[PDB]
Tab-separated table of C-alpha atoms in Angstrom:
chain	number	residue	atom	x	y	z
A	998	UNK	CA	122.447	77.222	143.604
A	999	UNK	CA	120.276	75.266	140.876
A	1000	UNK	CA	117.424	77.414	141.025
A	1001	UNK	CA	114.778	78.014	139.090
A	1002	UNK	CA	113.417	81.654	138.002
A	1003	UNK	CA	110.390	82.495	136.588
A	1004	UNK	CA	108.390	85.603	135.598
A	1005	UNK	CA	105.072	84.331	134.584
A	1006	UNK	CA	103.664	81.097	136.024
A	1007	UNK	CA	101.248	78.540	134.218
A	1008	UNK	CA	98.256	80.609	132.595
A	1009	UNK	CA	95.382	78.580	130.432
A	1010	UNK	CA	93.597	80.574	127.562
A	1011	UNK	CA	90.702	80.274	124.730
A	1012	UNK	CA	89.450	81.432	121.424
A	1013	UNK	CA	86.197	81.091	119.538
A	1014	UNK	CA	86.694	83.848	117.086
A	1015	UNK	CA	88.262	84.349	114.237
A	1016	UNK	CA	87.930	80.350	114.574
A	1017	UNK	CA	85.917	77.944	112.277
A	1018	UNK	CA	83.941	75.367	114.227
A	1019	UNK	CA	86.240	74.767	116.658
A	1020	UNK	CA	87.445	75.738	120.534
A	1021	UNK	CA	91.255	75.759	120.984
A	1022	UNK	CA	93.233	76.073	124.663
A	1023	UNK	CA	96.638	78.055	124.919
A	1024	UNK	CA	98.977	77.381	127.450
A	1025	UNK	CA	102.311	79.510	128.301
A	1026	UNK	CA	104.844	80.449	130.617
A	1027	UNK	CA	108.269	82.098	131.340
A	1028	UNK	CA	110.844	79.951	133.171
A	1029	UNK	CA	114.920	77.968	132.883
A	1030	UNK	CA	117.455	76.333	135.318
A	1031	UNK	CA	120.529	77.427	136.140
A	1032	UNK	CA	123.933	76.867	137.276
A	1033	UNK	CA	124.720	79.255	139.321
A	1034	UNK	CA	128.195	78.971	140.384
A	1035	UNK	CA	130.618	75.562	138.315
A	1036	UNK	CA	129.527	72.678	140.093
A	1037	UNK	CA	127.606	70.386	142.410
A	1038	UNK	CA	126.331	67.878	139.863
A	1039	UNK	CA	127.727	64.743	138.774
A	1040	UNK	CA	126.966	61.794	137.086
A	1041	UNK	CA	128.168	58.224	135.174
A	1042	UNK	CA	129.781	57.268	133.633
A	1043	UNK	CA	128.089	54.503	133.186
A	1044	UNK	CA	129.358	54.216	129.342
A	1045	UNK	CA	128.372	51.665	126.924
A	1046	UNK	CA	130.427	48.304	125.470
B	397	UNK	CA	65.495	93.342	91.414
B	398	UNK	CA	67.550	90.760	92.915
B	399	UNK	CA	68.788	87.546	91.222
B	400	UNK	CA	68.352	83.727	93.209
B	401	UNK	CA	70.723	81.569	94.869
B	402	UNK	CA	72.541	79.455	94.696
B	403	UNK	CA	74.576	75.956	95.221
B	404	UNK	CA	76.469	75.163	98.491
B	405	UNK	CA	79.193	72.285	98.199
B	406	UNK	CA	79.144	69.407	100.863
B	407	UNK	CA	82.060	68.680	102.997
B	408	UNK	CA	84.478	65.367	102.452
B	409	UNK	CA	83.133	64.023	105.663
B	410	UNK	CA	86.973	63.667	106.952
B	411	UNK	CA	87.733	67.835	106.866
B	412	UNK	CA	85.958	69.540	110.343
B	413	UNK	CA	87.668	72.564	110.457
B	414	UNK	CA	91.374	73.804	108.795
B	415	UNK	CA	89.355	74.368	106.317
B	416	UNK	CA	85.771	73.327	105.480
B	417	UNK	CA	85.922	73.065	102.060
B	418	UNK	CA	82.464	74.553	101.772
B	419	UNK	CA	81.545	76.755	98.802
B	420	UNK	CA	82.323	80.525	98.554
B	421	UNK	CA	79.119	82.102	97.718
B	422	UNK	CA	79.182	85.548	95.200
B	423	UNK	CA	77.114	88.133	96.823
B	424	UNK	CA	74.216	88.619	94.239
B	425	UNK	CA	74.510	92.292	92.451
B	426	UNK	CA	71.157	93.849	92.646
B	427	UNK	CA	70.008	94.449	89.243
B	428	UNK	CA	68.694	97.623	87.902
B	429	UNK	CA	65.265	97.654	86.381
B	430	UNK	CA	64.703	101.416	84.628
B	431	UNK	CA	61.540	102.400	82.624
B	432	UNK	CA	61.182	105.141	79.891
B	433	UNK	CA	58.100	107.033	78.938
B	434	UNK	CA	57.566	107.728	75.325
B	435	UNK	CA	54.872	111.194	74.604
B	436	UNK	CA	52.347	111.459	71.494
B	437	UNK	CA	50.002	114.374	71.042
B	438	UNK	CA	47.478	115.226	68.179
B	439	UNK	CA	45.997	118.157	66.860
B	440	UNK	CA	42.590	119.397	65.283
B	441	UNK	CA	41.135	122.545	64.214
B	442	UNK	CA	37.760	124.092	62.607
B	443	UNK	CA	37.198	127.435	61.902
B	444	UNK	CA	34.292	129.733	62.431
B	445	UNK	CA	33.014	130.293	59.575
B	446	UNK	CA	33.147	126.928	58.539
C-alpha cells in the first residue's frame, strides 16, 4: 500500500520541422499514487494562531 | 518573361522565432509575351502582245 503505477517511464523527444529557427525538447510520462486500502498516513496538526 | 523582386522586411531585433515578422513574398506570375504576324502581297501583270 502507497504505491506507485506507471505505464510509460520518462522518454525525451525533438523537433526541427515544421519549426522556425528553433530546436524544442518534449518530455512525458504516465504515472499517480495511490491509497490503496483507508489509511496509514497521518499528519499535524500543527494549526496556525 | 518574368517580373523582378522584391523587398524583404527586417526583424524587430527582440522577435527570434513565434513568429519572425519577416515579409511574405508574392510568387512573381510569369508574364506572357505573344507576337502576331501581319501578311501583304502585290500583284503585276503584262501581256503578250504588249
Amino acid at each position: 500500500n502507497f504505491v506507485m503505477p506507471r505505464q510509460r517511464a520518462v522518454t525525451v523527444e525533438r523537433e526541427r520541422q515544421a519549426g522556425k529557427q528553433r530546436d524544442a525538447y518534449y518530455v512525458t510520462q504516465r504515472v499517480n499514487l495511490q491509497r490503496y486500502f483507508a489509511n496509514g498516513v497521518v499528519s499535524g496538526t500543527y494549526a496556525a494562531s | 518573361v518574368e517580373p523582378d523582386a522584391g523587398k524583404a522586411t527586417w526583424v524587430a531585433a527582440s522577435t527570434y522565432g513565434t513568429d519572425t515578422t519577416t515579409g511574405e513574398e508574392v510568387k512573381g506570375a510569369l508574364k506572357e509575351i505573344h507576337f502576331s504576324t501581319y501578311k501583304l502581297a502585290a500583284k503585276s501583270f503584262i501581256t503578250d502582245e504588249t
